[PDB]
Design a protein around this ligand. Sequence first.
Ligand SMILES: CO[C@H]1O[C@H](CO)[C@@H](O)[C@H](O)[C@H]1NC(C)=O
Ligand SMILES: [Ca+2]
Length: 128
Amino acid sequence: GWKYFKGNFYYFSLIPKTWYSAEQFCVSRNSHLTSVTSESEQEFLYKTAGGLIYWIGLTKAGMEGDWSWVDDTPFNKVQSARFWIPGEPNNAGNNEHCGNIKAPSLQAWNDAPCDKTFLFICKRPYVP
Ligand SMILES: CO[C@H]1O[C@H](CO)[C@@H](O)[C@H](O)[C@H]1NC(C)=O
Ligand SMILES: [Ca+2]
């Protein structure tokens, strides 16, 4: 059921999980919760999500609580500013340390509690 886009395969889950149980599921399938590194990848993802919320690989790291990607893609704060929903990350209830795709827009991301269950998206490299 994996979808192909620019050198990577993507799995849009049918069952919801917490952010970490989701990441574990991806890791069991030789993948990670997806990073997003271009406007065209953001577009591919939110369009495919069809208006439902999906965990992606956004999570906090370091003392300062900077956002990071679980697949170890360096997080580019400047290049990613345009990808959040206006007002996000707002850190609601001071407990929103993971990120999902929420709005069908280039401005798509929301921070939500890691322990909430959502559908999720895995990303796996194609290696010829
Ligand atoms: C009202 O709470 C929700 O909406 C806000 C934005 O208004 C979001 O910032 C907030 O993360 C989200 N909460 C959950 C649980 O997803
Ligand atoms: Ca939020």
